[PDB]
Amino acid sequence: TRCVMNRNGVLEATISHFFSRSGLVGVVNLTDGGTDTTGYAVWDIDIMGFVQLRRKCEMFTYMRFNAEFTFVTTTENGEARPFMLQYMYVPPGAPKPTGRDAFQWQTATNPSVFVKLTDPPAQVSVPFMSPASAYQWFYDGYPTFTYGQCPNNMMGTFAVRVVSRVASQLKLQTRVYMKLKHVRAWIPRPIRSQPYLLKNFPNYDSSKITYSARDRASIKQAN
Amino acid sequence: TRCVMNRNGVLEATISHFFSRSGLVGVVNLTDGGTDTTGYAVWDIDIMGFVQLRRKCEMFTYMRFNAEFTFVTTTENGEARPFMLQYMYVPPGAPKPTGRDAFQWQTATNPSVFVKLTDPPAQVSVPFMSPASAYQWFYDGYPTFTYGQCPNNMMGTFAVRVVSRVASQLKLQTRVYMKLKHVRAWIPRPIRSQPYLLKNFPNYDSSKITYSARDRASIKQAN
Amino acid sequence: VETILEVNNTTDATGLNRLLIPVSAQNKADELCAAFMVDPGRIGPWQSTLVGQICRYYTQWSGSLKVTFMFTGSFMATGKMLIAYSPPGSAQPANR
Amino acid sequence: AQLTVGNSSITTQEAANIVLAYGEWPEYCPDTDATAVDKPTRPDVSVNRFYTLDSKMWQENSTGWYWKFPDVLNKTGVFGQNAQFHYLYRSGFCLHVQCNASKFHQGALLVAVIPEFVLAGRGSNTKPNEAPHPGFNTTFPGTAGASFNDPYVLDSGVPLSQSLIYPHQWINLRTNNCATIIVPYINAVPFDSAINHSNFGLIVVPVSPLKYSSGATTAIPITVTIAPLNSEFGGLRQ
Amino acid sequence: AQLTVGNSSITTQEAANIVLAYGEWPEYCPDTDATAVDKPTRPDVSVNRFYTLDSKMWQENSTGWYWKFPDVLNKTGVFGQNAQFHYLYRSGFCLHVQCNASKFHQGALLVAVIPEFVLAGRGSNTKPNEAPHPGFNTTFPGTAGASFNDPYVLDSGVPLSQSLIYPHQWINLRTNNCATIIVPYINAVPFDSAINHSNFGLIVVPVSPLKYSSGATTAIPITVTIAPLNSEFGGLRQ
Amino acid sequence: TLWYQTNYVVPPETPGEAYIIAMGAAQDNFTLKICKDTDEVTQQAVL
């Protein structure tokens, strides 16, 4: 029995280190062809997509941090070929790109970054973009002057394309990875135990109610 | 007779320099195809694999250091082509990846590093991950609350894949090389003279007992 | 650190006997009992010694050594052995 | 002279020619979180007594003997009672090994302590499902202590000739018939199980076989005495 | 203990129970006309080492042994090289005679130095042209040293019983197995030939014959060690 | 070299056959240089 007796340090227990270790939240696919596809792709910035940190994010109510996004790419095949892409961020309240060669891509206030695909993946730093002092993962109450949609959690969105007028016959799968800098949380919440049903709303099945602790034989027998 | 008379310096004699000069311990093969292979590979982190430093490691009992791993790759053919890989480390007590596209690869707490294959090999720094104050190469006594398996020598493991949904028809042989930083040993042990039979257990053939010193004619004749 | 030499290196000694220099009264005086070389990283009765083992892990060594001997017979017995060192560049002595 | 501790009393010669294993005395466990939260008991009154195991009979063909600590004491008196009823354990030891022989016997024995002494699984058969490990009786011999089978390799795949880096001592029947070692707690974690993990193990091996004349005693009696030091127990399980 | 000089090292017991021949220490040659005209070399570095001759086998019927100085060293190492290549010689000596015997042997030996030791021409035949002098091999035995034929007369016409006026010492196998003498230069002229004139001669004689039991060693080994002192050479001839 | 300066003197009733052990080590003045692996280990690896 390796019963340890030594007090270990407390630095991993900090919320800072509990939201570090950049991971993925979004994967998109981008195929370019003629008049049978789009040639571009749009992805709204989201947090609660992959349910591992949605649990870690609902553990509190109000949060504030800066984002560090990294865009890695490859072909569905796996090969990395020398093509020049274009990622563009779009702040909230701004029109999203509707087409490959539409005008929004040529927009200045919209920031963008141009890289080679044989270039190491790209990094960017988004600051705290909410009007409010913090994000609210819960906003019981209608936003009207259909229910509970927070008026301010949209960080913006992203748009990806290649830079060319030729339909480069290309099929990519782009992975993003997100790191959180200078987190500050508030008002801890208890952890959700029931599996989800749909995004952005904390519904639950009132029939297949799972139990947090599994079942044993009796109460007089531990093990 | 070049009989030297000059005292040489003592810096190579330190355990520090006796465990430096990063070398290999592990080579793995990774072929990607359809439903006749795995497309990925898993390698548990080990020390006693190649028997040159197993002898140098049993020369003591208790050791403590930090690891510096370097992952170099190539095709079995030899060519270096532009593909993006993924190495991921897995700490102990964590599930290992069972499939190429299984979910463990998308895990945050599991750290990972993405590189190009035309990128110089990757480097990483593992710290001392034992619960105990040191590693024990010998733990006479059962770990039960089948024999002598140290409860804490698992540094973790590694997993390698390419990042793509296509079965990139590719055959790689990956070599690792390990450097040791800030070694501190304890309780020197005498060096083993008998060849091994199997890993992790210091068995020996009680019939073909080799002798440390070879045989001469008599004792009254030196040479 | 003082380890033991495999000084009885032969084909006829199989176990601990490889480490023990025999001595008897059935041998005469003024004769050679035993001998060896002083060469840690060589094929001889040093490979059992940690000095020789560690010399195998290095190319060039230099310095001074200490060789000791230990007797185990009776308390009442008594004799006199000559322990003679002959430096290199020479042959081992013919007689005492 | 005479050494009396607790209720035991054993005579020996006057000597400060005694070895300290790695040059440190035993000592209690310093401040850890266990030392902070609770006080592990510090018995020093009666568990500290010179236990005298059963004599051993060295012969002309004897291989050698060894033991395992604290497994040799797991069923012996109040110490054993504390050992199988506290899953936390720590101690040092005073090992006083005597041989009782006449001046007409010759032979040389080696006394040595080995930390994390691991016995080897002989009978080479490279097979996962065979795995001829040594059994429970052998690796944990207990009070009597087993014997060797291949001393030149220490039954551990390790040559004996290099076994002097260990804290050792020579027993030569001419110069002295006794010797003594002191060993502190040797483990990579302050406490452990006293019952399913031995910290170290004593060995005695005849490096120069016993020899004698017609009409002498054919079996030398070798005894070992042991006295714990600064012991500590924790976690009384029932 | 241990005595180390030059490169030689010989162990013995601790002792100041050592005899000074006629109560004077050795010493270099004082001012003579030779000391005035030239400096005879004063080797003190390597010629001074405890030479250990071949052991001797004392038995139940042994007569005794003797040697001749410096003739015993005339062909031995660098000292011999200085001896046959300098017709002027002077020195003192430290003679450390040991016997190695068990406590079950009895017998008494006598150690003694004799100056101008002259051997006798036995085989009485009073005749000028016969003159049975002892031959060159006998009177100058050399390194090995010869034995006696008539000890009660010392093979010299001189009774042994009165041989204690000589600087002597008893070797009794009970009390001590070793002894030591120091003898200075004993000659009527400061220098002489080292090769054709011995200044003195050691003798060892069993005055009480060795005796022992069935199963004992039949031959006692007696060794002699020798170390010159304050030596001086002169006149290098080729 | 080890020579018999004398014979093994022996009392009655003892086998008169003994053994000498030879030990060796290095002094403080010893020094080592460039490291190289060893040869006595003929095994490449085990697993």
PDB file of N, CA and C in Angstrom, chain E residues 156-219:
ATOM      1  N   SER E 156      84.942 -24.171  15.171  1.00  0.00           N
ATOM      2  CA  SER E 156      86.023 -23.203  15.247  1.00  0.00           C
ATOM      3  C   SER E 156      86.993 -23.503  16.380  1.00  0.00           C
ATOM      4  N   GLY E 157      86.862 -24.646  17.046  1.00  0.00           N
ATOM      5  CA  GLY E 157      87.705 -24.942  18.184  1.00  0.00           C
ATOM      6  C   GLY E 157      87.363 -24.174  19.433  1.00  0.00           C
ATOM      7  N   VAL E 158      86.221 -23.497  19.458  1.00  0.00           N
ATOM      8  CA  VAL E 158      85.833 -22.629  20.560  1.00  0.00           C
ATOM      9  C   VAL E 158      84.540 -23.162  21.159  1.00  0.00           C
ATOM     10  N   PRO E 159      84.464 -23.355  22.470  1.00  0.00           N
ATOM     11  CA  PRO E 159      83.234 -23.881  23.062  1.00  0.00           C
ATOM     12  C   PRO E 159      82.082 -22.904  22.926  1.00  0.00           C
ATOM     13  N   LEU E 160      80.897 -23.462  22.683  1.00  0.00           N
ATOM     14  CA  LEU E 160      79.693 -22.657  22.534  1.00  0.00           C
ATOM     15  C   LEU E 160      79.239 -22.048  23.849  1.00  0.00           C
ATOM     16  N   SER E 161      79.430 -22.765  24.953  1.00  0.00           N
ATOM     17  CA  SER E 161      78.862 -22.342  26.224  1.00  0.00           C
ATOM     18  C   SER E 161      79.351 -20.965  26.631  1.00  0.00           C
ATOM     19  N   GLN E 162      80.539 -20.584  26.182  1.00  0.00           N
ATOM     20  CA  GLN E 162      81.118 -19.287  26.480  1.00  0.00           C
ATOM     21  C   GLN E 162      80.861 -18.280  25.376  1.00  0.00           C
ATOM     22  N   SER E 163      79.965 -18.599  24.453  1.00  0.00           N
ATOM     23  CA  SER E 163      79.723 -17.774  23.285  1.00  0.00           C
ATOM     24  C   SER E 163      78.751 -16.639  23.551  1.00  0.00           C
ATOM     25  N   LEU E 164      78.397 -16.396  24.807  1.00  0.00           N
ATOM     26  CA  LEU E 164      77.449 -15.347  25.141  1.00  0.00           C
ATOM     27  C   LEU E 164      78.111 -14.013  25.422  1.00  0.00           C
ATOM     28  N   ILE E 165      79.433 -13.977  25.572  1.00  0.00           N
ATOM     29  CA  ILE E 165      80.093 -12.684  25.637  1.00  0.00           C
ATOM     30  C   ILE E 165      79.855 -11.946  24.338  1.00  0.00           C
ATOM     31  N   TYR E 166      79.689 -12.691  23.254  1.00  0.00           N
ATOM     32  CA  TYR E 166      79.224 -12.123  22.012  1.00  0.00           C
ATOM     33  C   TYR E 166      77.864 -11.465  22.216  1.00  0.00           C
ATOM     34  N   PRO E 167      77.543 -10.444  21.438  1.00  0.00           N
ATOM     35  CA  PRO E 167      76.179  -9.915  21.469  1.00  0.00           C
ATOM     36  C   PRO E 167      75.207 -10.985  21.019  1.00  0.00           C
ATOM     37  N   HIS E 168      74.385 -11.470  21.936  1.00  0.00           N
ATOM     38  CA  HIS E 168      73.520 -12.602  21.675  1.00  0.00           C
ATOM     39  C   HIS E 168      72.070 -12.242  21.943  1.00  0.00           C
ATOM     40  N   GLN E 169      71.225 -13.251  21.784  1.00  0.00           N
ATOM     41  CA  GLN E 169      69.821 -13.171  22.138  1.00  0.00           C
ATOM     42  C   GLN E 169      69.208 -14.557  22.063  1.00  0.00           C
ATOM     43  N   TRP E 170      68.292 -14.826  22.977  1.00  0.00           N
ATOM     44  CA  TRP E 170      67.620 -16.108  23.029  1.00  0.00           C
ATOM     45  C   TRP E 170      66.370 -16.048  22.171  1.00  0.00           C
ATOM     46  N   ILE E 171      66.125 -17.113  21.424  1.00  0.00           N
ATOM     47  CA  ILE E 171      64.850 -17.338  20.772  1.00  0.00           C
ATOM     48  C   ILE E 171      64.219 -18.559  21.421  1.00  0.00           C
ATOM     49  N   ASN E 172      63.215 -18.328  22.254  1.00  0.00           N
ATOM     50  CA  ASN E 172      62.431 -19.397  22.842  1.00  0.00           C
ATOM     51  C   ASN E 172      61.042 -19.363  22.234  1.00  0.00           C
ATOM     52  N   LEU E 173      60.586 -20.521  21.774  1.00  0.00           N
ATOM     53  CA  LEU E 173      59.343 -20.614  21.030  1.00  0.00           C
ATOM     54  C   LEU E 173      58.127 -20.304  21.884  1.00  0.00           C
ATOM     55  N   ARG E 174      58.301 -20.205  23.195  1.00  0.00           N
ATOM     56  CA  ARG E 174      57.220 -19.870  24.106  1.00  0.00           C
ATOM     57  C   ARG E 174      57.023 -18.368  24.239  1.00  0.00           C
ATOM     58  N   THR E 175      58.101 -17.634  24.489  1.00  0.00           N
ATOM     59  CA  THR E 175      57.997 -16.249  24.921  1.00  0.00           C
ATOM     60  C   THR E 175      57.961 -15.298  23.735  1.00  0.00           C
ATOM     61  N   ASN E 176      58.841 -15.507  22.762  1.00  0.00           N
ATOM     62  CA  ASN E 176      58.904 -14.638  21.604  1.00  0.00           C
ATOM     63  C   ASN E 176      59.415 -15.432  20.420  1.00  0.00           C
ATOM     64  N   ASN E 177      58.879 -15.116  19.251  1.00  0.00           N
ATOM     65  CA  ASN E 177      59.248 -15.781  18.018  1.00  0.00           C
ATOM     66  C   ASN E 177      60.166 -14.924  17.165  1.00  0.00           C
ATOM     67  N   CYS E 178      60.570 -13.762  17.671  1.00  0.00           N
ATOM     68  CA  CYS E 178      61.398 -12.831  16.928  1.00  0.00           C
ATOM     69  C   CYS E 178      62.450 -12.233  17.850  1.00  0.00           C
ATOM     70  N   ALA E 179      63.477 -11.665  17.230  1.00  0.00           N
ATOM     71  CA  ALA E 179      64.524 -10.953  17.945  1.00  0.00           C
ATOM     72  C   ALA E 179      65.227 -10.042  16.956  1.00  0.00           C
ATOM     73  N   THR E 180      66.057  -9.153  17.488  1.00  0.00           N
ATOM     74  CA  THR E 180      66.714  -8.182  16.631  1.00  0.00           C
ATOM     75  C   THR E 180      68.006  -7.721  17.278  1.00  0.00           C
ATOM     76  N   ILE E 181      69.040  -7.614  16.458  1.00  0.00           N
ATOM     77  CA  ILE E 181      70.327  -7.070  16.846  1.00  0.00           C
ATOM     78  C   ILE E 181      70.672  -5.904  15.938  1.00  0.00           C
ATOM     79  N   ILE E 182      71.463  -4.981  16.471  1.00  0.00           N
ATOM     80  CA  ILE E 182      72.068  -3.909  15.697  1.00  0.00           C
ATOM     81  C   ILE E 182      73.565  -3.980  15.924  1.00  0.00           C
ATOM     82  N   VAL E 183      74.327  -4.057  14.839  1.00  0.00           N
ATOM     83  CA  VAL E 183      75.775  -4.160  14.970  1.00  0.00           C
ATOM     84  C   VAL E 183      76.466  -3.070  14.164  1.00  0.00           C
ATOM     85  N   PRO E 184      77.385  -2.334  14.750  1.00  0.00           N
ATOM     86  CA  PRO E 184      78.124  -1.334  13.982  1.00  0.00           C
ATOM     87  C   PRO E 184      79.284  -1.945  13.223  1.00  0.00           C
ATOM     88  N   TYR E 185      80.087  -1.099  12.590  1.00  0.00           N
ATOM     89  CA  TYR E 185      81.258  -1.567  11.866  1.00  0.00           C
ATOM     90  C   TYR E 185      82.314  -2.045  12.847  1.00  0.00           C
ATOM     91  N   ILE E 186      82.740  -3.286  12.692  1.00  0.00           N
ATOM     92  CA  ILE E 186      83.686  -3.916  13.605  1.00  0.00           C
ATOM     93  C   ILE E 186      84.892  -4.328  12.774  1.00  0.00           C
ATOM     94  N   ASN E 187      85.899  -3.464  12.734  1.00  0.00           N
ATOM     95  CA  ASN E 187      87.152  -3.800  12.083  1.00  0.00           C
ATOM     96  C   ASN E 187      88.241  -2.893  12.615  1.00  0.00           C
ATOM     97  N   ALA E 188      89.469  -3.379  12.526  1.00  0.00           N
ATOM     98  CA  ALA E 188      90.615  -2.646  13.031  1.00  0.00           C
ATOM     99  C   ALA E 188      91.128  -1.622  12.040  1.00  0.00           C
ATOM    100  N   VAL E 189      90.461  -1.470  10.905  1.00  0.00           N
ATOM    101  CA  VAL E 189      90.833  -0.460   9.925  1.00  0.00           C
ATOM    102  C   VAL E 189      89.567   0.065   9.254  1.00  0.00           C
ATOM    103  N   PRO E 190      89.415   1.381   9.112  1.00  0.00           N
ATOM    104  CA  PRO E 190      88.102   1.942   8.761  1.00  0.00           C
ATOM    105  C   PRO E 190      87.447   1.340   7.537  1.00  0.00           C
ATOM    106  N   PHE E 191      88.201   1.091   6.478  1.00  0.00           N
ATOM    107  CA  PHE E 191      87.657   0.474   5.280  1.00  0.00           C
ATOM    108  C   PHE E 191      88.388  -0.826   5.000  1.00  0.00           C
ATOM    109  N   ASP E 192      87.843  -1.593   4.077  1.00  0.00           N
ATOM    110  CA  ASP E 192      88.450  -2.853   3.680  1.00  0.00           C
ATOM    111  C   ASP E 192      87.761  -3.332   2.414  1.00  0.00           C
ATOM    112  N   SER E 193      88.079  -4.557   2.022  1.00  0.00           N
ATOM    113  CA  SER E 193      87.442  -5.188   0.882  1.00  0.00           C
ATOM    114  C   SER E 193      86.128  -5.811   1.313  1.00  0.00           C
ATOM    115  N   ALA E 194      85.094  -5.582   0.522  1.00  0.00           N
ATOM    116  CA  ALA E 194      83.788  -6.146   0.793  1.00  0.00           C
ATOM    117  C   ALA E 194      83.647  -7.554   0.246  1.00  0.00           C
ATOM    118  N   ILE E 195      84.636  -8.028  -0.506  1.00  0.00           N
ATOM    119  CA  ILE E 195      84.499  -9.256  -1.262  1.00  0.00           C
ATOM    120  C   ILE E 195      85.429 -10.357  -0.768  1.00  0.00           C
ATOM    121  N   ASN E 196      86.607 -10.017  -0.248  1.00  0.00           N
ATOM    122  CA  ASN E 196      87.562 -11.025   0.192  1.00  0.00           C
ATOM    123  C   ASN E 196      87.910 -10.873   1.668  1.00  0.00           C
ATOM    124  N   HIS E 197      87.024 -10.271   2.454  1.00  0.00           N
ATOM    125  CA  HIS E 197      87.185 -10.264   3.903  1.00  0.00           C
ATOM    126  C   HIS E 197      85.847  -9.972   4.549  1.00  0.00           C
ATOM    127  N   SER E 198      85.338 -10.928   5.311  1.00  0.00           N
ATOM    128  CA  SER E 198      84.133 -10.729   6.095  1.00  0.00           C
ATOM    129  C   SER E 198      84.490 -10.179   7.465  1.00  0.00           C
ATOM    130  N   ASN E 199      83.731  -9.180   7.905  1.00  0.00           N
ATOM    131  CA  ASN E 199      84.020  -8.548   9.183  1.00  0.00           C
ATOM    132  C   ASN E 199      83.537  -9.424  10.322  1.00  0.00           C
ATOM    133  N   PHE E 200      82.381 -10.048  10.146  1.00  0.00           N
ATOM    134  CA  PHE E 200      81.780 -10.860  11.188  1.00  0.00           C
ATOM    135  C   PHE E 200      80.845 -11.851  10.519  1.00  0.00           C
ATOM    136  N   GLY E 201      80.162 -12.630  11.341  1.00  0.00           N
ATOM    137  CA  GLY E 201      79.346 -13.706  10.834  1.00  0.00           C
ATOM    138  C   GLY E 201      78.253 -14.081  11.801  1.00  0.00           C
ATOM    139  N   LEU E 202      77.038 -14.193  11.292  1.00  0.00           N
ATOM    140  CA  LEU E 202      75.913 -14.593  12.112  1.00  0.00           C
ATOM    141  C   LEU E 202      75.924 -16.099  12.301  1.00  0.00           C
ATOM    142  N   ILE E 203      75.453 -16.534  13.461  1.00  0.00           N
ATOM    143  CA  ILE E 203      75.232 -17.945  13.732  1.00  0.00           C
ATOM    144  C   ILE E 203      73.858 -18.131  14.343  1.00  0.00           C
ATOM    145  N   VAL E 204      73.204 -19.223  13.971  1.00  0.00           N
ATOM    146  CA  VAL E 204      72.011 -19.696  14.649  1.00  0.00           C
ATOM    147  C   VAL E 204      72.170 -21.179  14.915  1.00  0.00           C
ATOM    148  N   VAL E 205      71.971 -21.576  16.164  1.00  0.00           N
ATOM    149  CA  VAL E 205      72.182 -22.958  16.567  1.00  0.00           C
ATOM    150  C   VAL E 205      71.025 -23.422  17.438  1.00  0.00           C
ATOM    151  N   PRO E 206      70.467 -24.585  17.182  1.00  0.00           N
ATOM    152  CA  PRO E 206      69.456 -25.119  18.089  1.00  0.00           C
ATOM    153  C   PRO E 206      70.091 -25.676  19.343  1.00  0.00           C
ATOM    154  N   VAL E 207      70.002 -24.911  20.427  1.00  0.00           N
ATOM    155  CA  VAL E 207      70.512 -25.373  21.707  1.00  0.00           C
ATOM    156  C   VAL E 207      69.500 -26.249  22.413  1.00  0.00           C
ATOM    157  N   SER E 208      68.252 -26.230  21.973  1.00  0.00           N
ATOM    158  CA  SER E 208      67.277 -27.180  22.476  1.00  0.00           C
ATOM    159  C   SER E 208      66.488 -27.710  21.292  1.00  0.00           C
ATOM    160  N   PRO E 209      66.726 -28.956  20.900  1.00  0.00           N
ATOM    161  CA  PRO E 209      66.226 -29.434  19.614  1.00  0.00           C
ATOM    162  C   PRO E 209      64.718 -29.340  19.517  1.00  0.00           C
ATOM    163  N   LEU E 210      64.253 -29.066  18.306  1.00  0.00           N
ATOM    164  CA  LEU E 210      62.825 -29.018  18.056  1.00  0.00           C
ATOM    165  C   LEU E 210      62.186 -30.353  18.400  1.00  0.00           C
ATOM    166  N   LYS E 211      60.983 -30.283  18.955  1.00  0.00           N
ATOM    167  CA  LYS E 211      60.199 -31.466  19.255  1.00  0.00           C
ATOM    168  C   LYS E 211      58.731 -31.127  19.073  1.00  0.00           C
ATOM    169  N   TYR E 212      57.942 -32.124  18.687  1.00  0.00           N
ATOM    170  CA  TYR E 212      56.531 -31.884  18.437  1.00  0.00           C
ATOM    171  C   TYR E 212      55.781 -33.206  18.472  1.00  0.00           C
ATOM    172  N   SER E 213      54.492 -33.127  18.168  1.00  0.00           N
ATOM    173  CA  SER E 213      53.571 -34.246  18.255  1.00  0.00           C
ATOM    174  C   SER E 213      53.319 -34.850  16.883  1.00  0.00           C
ATOM    175  N   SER E 214      52.606 -35.970  16.889  1.00  0.00           N
ATOM    176  CA  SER E 214      52.179 -36.593  15.647  1.00  0.00           C
ATOM    177  C   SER E 214      51.132 -35.720  14.974  1.00  0.00           C
ATOM    178  N   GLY E 215      51.419 -35.302  13.748  1.00  0.00           N
ATOM    179  CA  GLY E 215      50.510 -34.486  12.978  1.00  0.00           C
ATOM    180  C   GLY E 215      50.873 -33.026  12.935  1.00  0.00           C
ATOM    181  N   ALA E 216      52.009 -32.647  13.501  1.00  0.00           N
ATOM    182  CA  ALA E 216      52.470 -31.273  13.463  1.00  0.00           C
ATOM    183  C   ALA E 216      53.351 -31.046  12.244  1.00  0.00           C
ATOM    184  N   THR E 217      53.656 -29.780  11.990  1.00  0.00           N
ATOM    185  CA  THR E 217      54.657 -29.449  10.991  1.00  0.00           C
ATOM    186  C   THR E 217      56.030 -29.916  11.455  1.00  0.00           C
ATOM    187  N   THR E 218      56.750 -30.586  10.562  1.00  0.00           N
ATOM    188  CA  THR E 218      58.040 -31.185  10.873  1.00  0.00           C
ATOM    189  C   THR E 218      59.210 -30.239  10.665  1.00  0.00           C
ATOM    190  N   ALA E 219      58.984 -29.069  10.079  1.00  0.00           N
ATOM    191  CA  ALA E 219      60.064 -28.145   9.755  1.00  0.00           C
ATOM    192  C   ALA E 219      59.617 -26.731  10.075  1.00  0.00           C
TER     193      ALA E 219
END
